[PDB]
Amino acid sequence: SAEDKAAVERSKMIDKCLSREKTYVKRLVKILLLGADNSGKSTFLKQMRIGIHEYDFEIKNVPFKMVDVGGQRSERKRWFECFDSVTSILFLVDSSDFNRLTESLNDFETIVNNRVFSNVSIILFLNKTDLLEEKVQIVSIKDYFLEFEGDPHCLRDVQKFLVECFRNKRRDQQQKPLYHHFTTAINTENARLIFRDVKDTILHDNLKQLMLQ
Amino acid sequence: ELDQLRQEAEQLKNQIRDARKACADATLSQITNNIDPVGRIQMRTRRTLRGHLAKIYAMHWGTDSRLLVSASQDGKLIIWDSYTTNKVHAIPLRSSWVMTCAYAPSGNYVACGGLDNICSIYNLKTREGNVRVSRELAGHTGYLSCCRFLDDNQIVTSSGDTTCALWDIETGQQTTTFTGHTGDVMSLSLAPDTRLFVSGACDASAKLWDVREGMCRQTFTGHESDINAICFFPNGNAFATGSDDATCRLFDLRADQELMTYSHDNIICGITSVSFSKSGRLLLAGYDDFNCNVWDALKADRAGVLAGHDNRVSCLGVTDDGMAVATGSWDSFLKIWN
Amino acid sequence: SSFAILMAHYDVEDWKLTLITRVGLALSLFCLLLCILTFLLVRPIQGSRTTIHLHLCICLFVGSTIFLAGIENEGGQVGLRCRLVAGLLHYCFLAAFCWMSLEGLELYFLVVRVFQGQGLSTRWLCLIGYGVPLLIVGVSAAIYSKGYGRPRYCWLDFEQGFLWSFLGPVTFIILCNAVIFVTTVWKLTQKFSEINPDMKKLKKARALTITAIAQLFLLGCTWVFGLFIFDDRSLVLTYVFTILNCLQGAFLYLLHCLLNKKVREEYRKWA
Amino acid sequence: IAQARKLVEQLKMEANIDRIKVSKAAADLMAYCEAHAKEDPLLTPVPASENPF
């Protein structure tokens, strides 16, 4: 009856737009991005481009959505369940700054041990690796971490200790692995690293689905 | 200095508890023992609203009891015509983590918000039918959890600041700030006369506020977990509250205490949404067990079950005329029940 | 009479093979009807997996029923009904193999093109798995319609090489599915320790064996024993093919309904 | 300092509130539910002619 037909046509147009974006939705990969002000998060995001902010980009024709939580923590079930569909958590840390390493470890422990983030993988980026070579051979990480074992002036020992410190803050039932990369925020290989880690995580899920028992 | 005031607070709390005990002479169940039960209540899905691509977190009815606004994780609002299952609008949002949505009583504006810390106002009726952001309300330091229009110009929002705010949309300013909660405020409910409103926070407490004076008239306790939903009784002299302890409670404003508890042993999951029927006899509650339970509000009896959804029933809604019930869920579907 | 007629380059005759075929096919038809009900009713398991499984089971059920009812010829003369049932059997089993190739393609989408959403819809799956057989059967009938039916059985004709119209697609699908099966097994063995860290080595072998066998019965690699049936010299291969492929529906039912946790949960919820 | 004083003052305003008996409140809720039972489509289902769904 004149207006009814127009209303149905408008509904059909809206449905067509929704169907057009549905294929993108079913094929999108979401990653949490967590980092402090010293972690080089802004430089990392700017290099890949070249409140909570959403970054949309594509790697090898796969749509990605990095969710940048700008230091907002809520420790509530609703806030964590808002991110129950992410495939991975990306964590940037300033590996050089030993005085703020404990704060980063505590934040990591608070986030990755939530029941919502069970069955999501962790990609851990240790930025400022070039600055570690300067800071190593000048200061000793034993001055900040008395549990350190090895040569504090060796880069491999310090890097292994940092990755072990972050791995030990993950409680039991680690269904998904922890991926660590020693990179810089201006590195051009970071997108490929994230792509490979996410692909491995999704392969883990797919093979677990193939598991009969 | 500190010890004296700490003891004074305890004495005042004991005095309030004693007054509440003195006003409690006969329980609601005892008085309503002689009222006949409402019997089995069967509601059937009349409409299924499909089109959302992700979990539906919020939903609000219109004053005309025909139009419907819904919010989903995919990052947009849809205005539905429930009589004909027609999409009137599809409004993309700047932030995809929307947690609440409001529909103005006039029908000219809708509101939404979430993790973006902003209450965004959209004008539905502009020139040549273009829906644009009329106003963005900033000032909340936490995620915005609920919003309800008082009129086209003022709106009350609750956030993770443990505070509520009354806004002026024309100026975009917080006219009045409501402080006093210790946990994150998760729910709101405007009184039918629009003069009072109750808020439920993550401190197992509900507070009654005066919009004009900006003060907490009463504080209600009794729950054991985070209050997720709250709703006034139709007459405005009482309200209901659902929390994560698998329990609904009915609180009286004038008696200033809990009247009766809605719970069952078989229910252990949290309650996401509560609503009343037009007469107040039915208390509809949505649960994490994929179901919506209908309660006899005067006898604390399960009148019926709404069991059409496949995921968490995240929102409920009853029309002003009381004809239909809209249930939103995490399966990206809205269902209309009679 | 025997299930090996679908692959044999001669007229296989053995009462034991006929009895095995009848018993196994009755049991498999019961299990395949159960499979169709499970794949159509159990909501939590719905997906591309379940769609391809359901349509493969439908094709196997229809083909097995037509085989049980009309594979034998009476009177020694090839009538019109014999051509019709020959063509129907050709279409049904070629459709089953097309849906098996779709199983393989979906497995490729799982283990190689790991990211989800890049796949084929239900309409395209049905179009492929029900129209490629239609194309092949139509072309074969147009070229050589006299190849449908024999005086002994109502299934193709090996004198002019017409049986390769069924064997060639089967061979191609079997080789492709074998490649994807080896890839799947390799990836699964690589990642089992990460997926299940504390399931030991004996239970590792048990789980890997069960999963590999389920995929083998999905992909149709059990039909490779029929590609070497030319003479009486291959009785062992003939019996192996008949036993493994008359029980294919039953094995699929076991390994994909009785060994699925969600199916058991829905079964318990139903009762 | 300020927080304790504000809490005490708020509790003082909460204490000096004219409360009524819960029997009267239950009676008022009963009266409202009984006065509007015929106007509730969910409690009393409406004939299909007058149901817009």
PDB file of N, CA and C in Angstrom, chain A residues 6 27 32 41 49 59 99 101 103-104 111-113 119 129 131 137 160 165 174 203 213:
ATOM      1  N   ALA A   6       7.602   0.895  -0.287  1.00  0.00           N
ATOM      2  CA  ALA A   6       8.822   1.669  -0.082  1.00  0.00           C
ATOM      3  C   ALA A   6       9.574   1.198   1.156  1.00  0.00           C
ATOM      4  N   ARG A  27      35.295 -13.369   8.087  1.00  0.00           N
ATOM      5  CA  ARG A  27      36.654 -13.625   7.641  1.00  0.00           C
ATOM      6  C   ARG A  27      37.662 -12.707   8.331  1.00  0.00           C
ATOM      7  N   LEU A  32      44.119  -8.210  20.205  1.00  0.00           N
ATOM      8  CA  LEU A  32      44.333  -7.194  21.227  1.00  0.00           C
ATOM      9  C   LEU A  32      45.768  -6.695  21.195  1.00  0.00           C
ATOM     10  N   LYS A  41      54.534   1.533  21.109  1.00  0.00           N
ATOM     11  CA  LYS A  41      53.289   1.114  20.478  1.00  0.00           C
ATOM     12  C   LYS A  41      52.901   2.044  19.335  1.00  0.00           C
ATOM     13  N   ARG A  49      51.078   0.915   9.525  1.00  0.00           N
ATOM     14  CA  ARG A  49      50.186   1.678   8.655  1.00  0.00           C
ATOM     15  C   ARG A  49      50.908   2.140   7.396  1.00  0.00           C
ATOM     16  N   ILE A  59      46.795  -8.277   5.739  1.00  0.00           N
ATOM     17  CA  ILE A  59      48.061  -8.947   5.471  1.00  0.00           C
ATOM     18  C   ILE A  59      47.764 -10.180   4.633  1.00  0.00           C
ATOM     19  N   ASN A  99      63.619  -0.890  35.126  1.00  0.00           N
ATOM     20  CA  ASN A  99      62.944  -0.332  36.292  1.00  0.00           C
ATOM     21  C   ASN A  99      61.429  -0.448  36.167  1.00  0.00           C
ATOM     22  N   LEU A 101      60.020  -3.023  34.313  1.00  0.00           N
ATOM     23  CA  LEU A 101      59.732  -4.366  33.823  1.00  0.00           C
ATOM     24  C   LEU A 101      58.759  -5.095  34.741  1.00  0.00           C
ATOM     25  N   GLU A 103      56.289  -3.754  36.484  1.00  0.00           N
ATOM     26  CA  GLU A 103      54.942  -3.274  36.188  1.00  0.00           C
ATOM     27  C   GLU A 103      54.375  -3.951  34.946  1.00  0.00           C
ATOM     28  N   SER A 104      55.197  -4.095  33.905  1.00  0.00           N
ATOM     29  CA  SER A 104      54.759  -4.779  32.695  1.00  0.00           C
ATOM     30  C   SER A 104      54.427  -6.237  32.976  1.00  0.00           C
ATOM     31  N   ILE A 111      46.270  -9.644  32.898  1.00  0.00           N
ATOM     32  CA  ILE A 111      45.472  -9.801  31.684  1.00  0.00           C
ATOM     33  C   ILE A 111      45.401 -11.260  31.247  1.00  0.00           C
ATOM     34  N   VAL A 112      46.552 -11.911  31.058  1.00  0.00           N
ATOM     35  CA  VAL A 112      46.552 -13.192  30.355  1.00  0.00           C
ATOM     36  C   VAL A 112      45.986 -14.329  31.193  1.00  0.00           C
ATOM     37  N   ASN A 113      45.769 -14.120  32.487  1.00  0.00           N
ATOM     38  CA  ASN A 113      45.249 -15.171  33.349  1.00  0.00           C
ATOM     39  C   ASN A 113      43.741 -15.103  33.536  1.00  0.00           C
ATOM     40  N   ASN A 119      42.341 -20.088  26.027  1.00  0.00           N
ATOM     41  CA  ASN A 119      42.261 -20.500  24.624  1.00  0.00           C
ATOM     42  C   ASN A 119      42.457 -19.330  23.660  1.00  0.00           C
ATOM     43  N   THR A 129      65.259  -3.719  21.223  1.00  0.00           N
ATOM     44  CA  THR A 129      66.332  -4.705  21.294  1.00  0.00           C
ATOM     45  C   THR A 129      67.685  -4.066  21.010  1.00  0.00           C
ATOM     46  N   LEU A 131      68.483  -1.118  21.897  1.00  0.00           N
ATOM     47  CA  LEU A 131      68.842  -0.434  23.132  1.00  0.00           C
ATOM     48  C   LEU A 131      69.279  -1.401  24.226  1.00  0.00           C
ATOM     49  N   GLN A 137      75.971  -4.652  29.257  1.00  0.00           N
ATOM     50  CA  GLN A 137      77.379  -4.272  29.400  1.00  0.00           C
ATOM     51  C   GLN A 137      77.554  -2.949  30.135  1.00  0.00           C
ATOM     52  N   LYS A 160      66.727 -14.507  27.247  1.00  0.00           N
ATOM     53  CA  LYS A 160      66.122 -15.739  27.737  1.00  0.00           C
ATOM     54  C   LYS A 160      65.465 -15.524  29.091  1.00  0.00           C
ATOM     55  N   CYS A 165      60.666 -14.951  32.359  1.00  0.00           N
ATOM     56  CA  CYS A 165      59.895 -14.186  33.330  1.00  0.00           C
ATOM     57  C   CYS A 165      58.473 -13.964  32.846  1.00  0.00           C
ATOM     58  N   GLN A 174      47.871 -23.909  29.968  1.00  0.00           N
ATOM     59  CA  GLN A 174      48.266 -23.061  28.844  1.00  0.00           C
ATOM     60  C   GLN A 174      47.909 -23.791  27.558  1.00  0.00           C
ATOM     61  N   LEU A 203      45.477 -22.730  13.113  1.00  0.00           N
ATOM     62  CA  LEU A 203      45.726 -24.129  12.779  1.00  0.00           C
ATOM     63  C   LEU A 203      45.583 -25.026  13.999  1.00  0.00           C
ATOM     64  N   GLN A 213      38.480 -37.169  19.721  1.00  0.00           N
ATOM     65  CA  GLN A 213      38.336 -37.216  21.171  1.00  0.00           C
ATOM     66  C   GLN A 213      39.501 -36.513  21.860  1.00  0.00           C
TER      67      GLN A 213
END
